[PDB]
RNA sequence: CGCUGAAAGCAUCUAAGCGGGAAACUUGCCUCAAGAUGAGAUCUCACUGGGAACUUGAUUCCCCUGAAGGGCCGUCGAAG
RNA sequence: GAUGUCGGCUCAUCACAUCCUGGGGCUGAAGCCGGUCCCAAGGGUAUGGCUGUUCGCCAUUUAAAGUGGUACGCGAGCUGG
RNA sequence: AGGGAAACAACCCAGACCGCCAGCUAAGGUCCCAAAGUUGUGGUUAAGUGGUAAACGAUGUGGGAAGGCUUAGACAGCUA
């Protein structure tokens, strides 16, 4: 019978992507296939197989045309009359680290799968990052 | 025709900076002004200058005209400084610059005292006129627009800051 | 202004811009002739 | 920065004009600074500082250590201030002093509490009738929401429960008297909380 | 409402560039707020015994040991 | 083999096609007032006489006494004209 | 009944005797949720059109035939 991955055997990497230029929603694809392991040959959906990823240049990120001064990120409070929305410009000097991160979530399965798939993604909005000791390897540039 | 073919034939010893992203002229009677274009071709010449054009778009056509007549009016303005004639009309007005502060009189109840940003000059030979003296012309005509809307004109009076000659309209009351 | 759906010019010193994606009318004459959208 | 004071009741002086000002006697021990928290190690910028007198077999040993890096020995109570920009080093004790007459100041204390309030007084939300035919409703809250349609009671509405001791600041009194003999705070108008509670003095936001 | 300015020799607030702009928006002022499962940060305090089984992040048992502390209990409280 | 109908009280929430306050083209806008149209939903938005009345018509105010949706909001919350 | 149209008796596809961890296809599809092309070629649209609509308006743009005038100097522009 077909072979299943088994959760004590799983190797898994350390990559790390720079975003100095990359559209939004093109870089996070990649992203977003690589965290849930299609690039592996042994891969089941119901375990979690695949790669720590982190993200160097969260504020360099490029979106195309018109949609700089637009598309409103909105969200609801619970409270009557709380709707709030925020568009794409003045989200990123704010908080520059939850524009590549909403993104990417909504290219995951909604399951506990997809919030422990989500725990490996680890962005930053700086240069460096703090996991020299586990020595990622670059990919993609 | 198009001003984009016309060269530019820089007078009397002005001096190109050009690093071929960021031109930078400068002459005698001020100094220091300097452009960046996104996309031409420029030749530096014996004396004049032209302004090529790549991809034959809307928008490199429109380009060259463009940085053309930019670069044209930073010729003029080490030449020659550029002015703007702005009259006051109507009783009790008055202006008079002190120093680098322009202090007005126009009827309201606490007087006005504009600064002027930069290095750029304003002359009162009478009370009621403003010489504004500089070297390019968005600076030299925003500053003068700021001016002017303290107290706009009137089509019933005049009464109000008004400049060169050739701007009213009017009616009875 | 005047809010229209038809613009169009009326004496002949308008004209007709479409500045910023609408279509304006200024006139360098009579104030009157001003019309904002259409 | 701040004095942690106490208050200690209500009474009126007069100007020698004929006017009378409503006062609010406030009592201050001195404080002392038990440690300065600098920016570095901490972030944010801050003094801790700590008003005198509990008895030496209430204190735990963890406290008791943490009050012997500075000589402090200290009383109940250890309260926080975020500063902008001064020195204050081992142990200083911060005294009436910093103010004057004039001063606009913030006080912050709790408040009385009342136990478990309806809406009439929580919320000041008149009634329902007396006679002319009422049932036993007769200061009951009226009715929530809406039929069918939201089907639900709406997050934030305003029933009824406990009015608070919660932590309520007045906001610009003003400072009548400064006392460093009998180490007294004079202040014109209301003070929250009640008699011999605890009251902490800032000098005023908006002012 | 503009200032420079082409395409379209002129004109033109716009295509590039550069500003002014209202109780609405985001801070600003008052309160809750790390169950913020991403569960943060400082300072200071406590505890330094063996043995066997079975299999060694070693697990389990037996015996000595119970500290920092906390809780029950009592007198109460402008807290309930 | 049951979804209790009009007006009042209590408590409300949203729309904007704006009654008030805020910014403002044009006027057959002298000034004080206005007329009309674009932008704006932040907070406000009357006590009474007469009728079962909502509506209305009056008296007196006020910066103004807005027009709609929510089983023509709301009876396991009240009344029963 | 099954597959497609996000969920969708009656619209498209196809009519289930039972078992299989076997293969080729239909309508619908091939960036990620979600199985399969970030395939090749030639153009077009900048409005997020695609991803709701009418009289009507407009120097938006791409193509195709038309003409009208013009180095004897046209159209613009500055000059009476």
Same mark, same amino acid.
């Given at each position: 019978?077909?072979?299943?991955?088994?959760?004590?055997?799983?190797?898994?990497?350390?990559?790390?992507?720079?975003?100095?230029?990359?559209?939004?929603?093109?870089?996070?694809?990649?992203?977003?296939?690589?965290?849930?392991?299609?690039?592996?040959?042994?891969?089941?959906?119901?375990?979690?197989?695949?790669?720590?990823?982190?993200?160097?240049?969260?504020?360099?990120?490029?979106?195309?045309?018109?949609?700089?001064?637009?598309?409103?990120?909105?969200?609801?409070?619970?409270?009557?009359?709380?709707?709030?929305?925020?568009?794409?410009?003045?989200?990123?000097?704010?908080?520059?680290?939850?524009?590549?991160?909403?993104?990417?979530?909504?290219?995951?399965?909604?399951?506990?799968?997809? &919030?422990?798939?989500?725990?490996?993604?680890?962005?930053?909005?700086?240069?460096?990052?703090?996991?020299?000791?586990?020595?990622?390897?670059?990919?993609?540039? | 025709?198009?001003?984009?073919?016309?060269?530019?034939?820089?007078?009397?010893?002005?001096?190109?900076? +050009?690093?071929?992203?960021?031109?930078?002229?400068?002459?005698?009677?001020?100094?220091?002004?300097?452009?960046? @274009?996104?996309?031409?071709?420029?030749?530096?010449?014996?004396?004049? /200058?032209?302004?090529?054009?790549?991809?034959?778009?809307?928008?490199?056509?429109?380009?060259?005209?463009?940085?053309?007549?930019?670069?044209?009016?930073?010729?003029?303005?080490?030449?020659?400084?550029?002015?703007?004639?702005?009259?006051?009309? *109507?009783?009790?007005?008055?202006?008079?610059?002190?120093?680098?502060?322009?202090?007005?009189?126009?009827?309201?109840?606490?007087?006005?005292?504009?600064?002027?940003?930069?290095?750029?000059?304003?002359? %009162?030979?009478?009370?009621?006129?403003? /010489?504004?003296?500089?070297?390019?012309?968005?600076?030299?005509?925003?500053?003068?627009?700021?001016?002017?809307?303290?107290?706009?004109?009137?089509?019933?009076?005049?009464? $109000?800051?008004?400049?060169?000659?050739?701007?009213?309209?009017?009616?009875?009351? | 202004?005047?809010?229209?759906?038809?613009?169009?010019?009326?004496? &002949?010193?308008?004209?007709?811009?479409? #500045?910023?994606?609408? !279509?304006?009318?200024?006139?360098?004459?009579?104030?009157?002739?001003?019309?904002?959208?259409? | 920065?701040?004095? !942690?004071?106490?208050?200690? *009741?209500?009474?009126?002086?007069?100007?020698?004009?004929?006017?009378?000002?409503?006062?609010?006697?406030?009592?201050?021990?001195?404080?002392?600074? %038990?440690?300065?928290?600098?920016?570095?190690?901490?972030?944010?910028?801050? !003094?801790?500082?700590?008003?005198?007198?509990?008895?030496?077999?209430?204190? %735990?040993?963890?406290?008791? $250590?943490?009050?012997?890096?500075?000589?402090?020995?200290?009383?109940?109570?250890? =309260?926080?201030?975020?500063?902008?920009?001064?020195?204050?080093?081992?142990?200083?004790?911060?005294?009436?002093? +910093?103010?004057?007459? $004039?001063?606009?100041?913030?006080?912050?204390?709790?408040?009385?509490?009342?136990?478990?309030?309806?809406?009439?007084?929580? =919320?000041?939300?008149?009634?329902?009738?007396?006679?002319? *035919?009422?049932? !036993?409703?007769? &200061?009951?809250?009226?009715?929530?929401?809406?039929?069918?349609?939201?089907?639900?009671?709406?997050?934030?509405?305003?029933?009824?429960? @406990?009015?608070?001791?919660? #932590?309520?600041?007045?906001?610009?009194?003003?400072?009548?008297?400064?006392?460093?003999?009998?180490?007294?705070?004079?202040?014109?108008?209301?003070?929250? *909380?009640?008699?011999?509670?605890?009251?902490?003095?800032?000098?005023?936001?908006?002012?």
């Amino acid at each position: 019978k077909t072979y299943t991955a088994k959760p004590e055997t799983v190797q898994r990497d350390w990559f790390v992507v720079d975003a100095a230029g990359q559209t939004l929603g093109r870089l996070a694809t990649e992203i977003a296939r690589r965290l849930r392991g299609k690039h592996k040959p042994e891969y089941t959906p119901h375990v979690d197989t695949g790669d720590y990823i982190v993200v160097i240049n969260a504020e360099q990120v490029r979106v195309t045309g018109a949609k700089t001064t637009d598309k409103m990120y909105y969200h609801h409070s619970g409270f009557p009359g709380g709707i709030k929305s925020i568009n794409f410009e003045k989200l990123i000097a704010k908080a520059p680290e939850r524009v590549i991160e909403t993104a990417v979530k909504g290219m995951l399965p909604k399951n506990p799968l997809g &919030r422990d798939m989500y725990r490996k993604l680890k962005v930053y909005k700086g240069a460096s990052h703090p996991h020299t000791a586990q020595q990622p390897q670059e990919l993609k540039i | 025709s198009r001003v984009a073919k016309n060269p530019v034939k820089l007078p009397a010893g002005v001096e190109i900076k +050009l690093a071929g992203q960021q031109l930078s002229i400068k002459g005698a009677k001020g100094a220091l002004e300097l452009k960046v @274009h996104p996309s031409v071709e420029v030749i530096q010449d014996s004396g004049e /200058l032209r302004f090529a054009a790549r991809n034959g778009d809307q928008q490199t056509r429109a380009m060259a005209g463009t940085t053309r007549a930019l670069v044209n009016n930073m010729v003029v303005g080490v030449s020659q400084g550029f002015e703007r004639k702005l009259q006051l009309v *109507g009783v009790g007005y008055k202006a008079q610059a002190k120093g680098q502060v322009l202090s007005l009189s126009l009827g309201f109840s606490h007087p006005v005292d504009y600064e002027l940003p930069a290095g750029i000059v304003a002359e %009162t030979p009478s009370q009621t006129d403003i /010489l504004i003296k500089g070297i390019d012309k968005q600076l030299v005509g925003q500053v003068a627009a700021e001016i002017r809307d303290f107290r706009p004109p009137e089509p019933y009076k005049g009464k $109000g800051v008004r400049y060169a000659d050739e701007v009213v309209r009017r009616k009875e009351a | 202004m005047k809010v229209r759906a038809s613009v169009k010019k009326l004496c &002949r010193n308008c004209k007709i811009i479409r #500045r910023d994606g609408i !279509v304006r009318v200024i006139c360098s004459a009579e104030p009157r002739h001003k019309q904002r959208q259409g | 920065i701040g004095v !942690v004071g106490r208050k200690c *009741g209500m009474t009126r002086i007069f100007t020698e004009e004929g006017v009378s000002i409503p006062v609010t006697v406030i009592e201050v021990e001195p404080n002392r600074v %038990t440690q300065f928290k600098t920016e570095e190690t901490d972030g944010y910028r801050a !003094v801790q500082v700590t008003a005198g007198e509990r008895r030496a077999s209430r204190v %735990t040993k963890a406290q008791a $250590g943490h009050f012997a890096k500075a000589n402090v020995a200290a009383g109940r109570g250890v =309260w926080e201030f975020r500063l902008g920009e001064e020195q204050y080093a081992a142990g200083d004790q911060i005294t009436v002093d +910093l103010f004057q007459a $004039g001063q606009m100041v913030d006080v912050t204390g709790e408040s009385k509490g009342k136990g478990f309030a309806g809406t009439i007084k929580r =919320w000041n939300f008149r009634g329902q009738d007396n006679t002319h *035919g009422n049932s !036993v409703s007769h &200061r009951v809250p009226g009715s929530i929401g809406q039929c069918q349609t939201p089907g639900r009671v709406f997050k934030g509405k305003k029933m009824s429960g @406990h009015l608070g001791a919660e #932590r309520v600041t007045v906001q610009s009194l003003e400072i009548v008297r400064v006392d460093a003999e009998r180490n007294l705070l004079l202040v014109k108008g209301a003070v929250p *909380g009640a008699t011999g509670g605890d009251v902490i003095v800032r000098p005023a936001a908006k002012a």
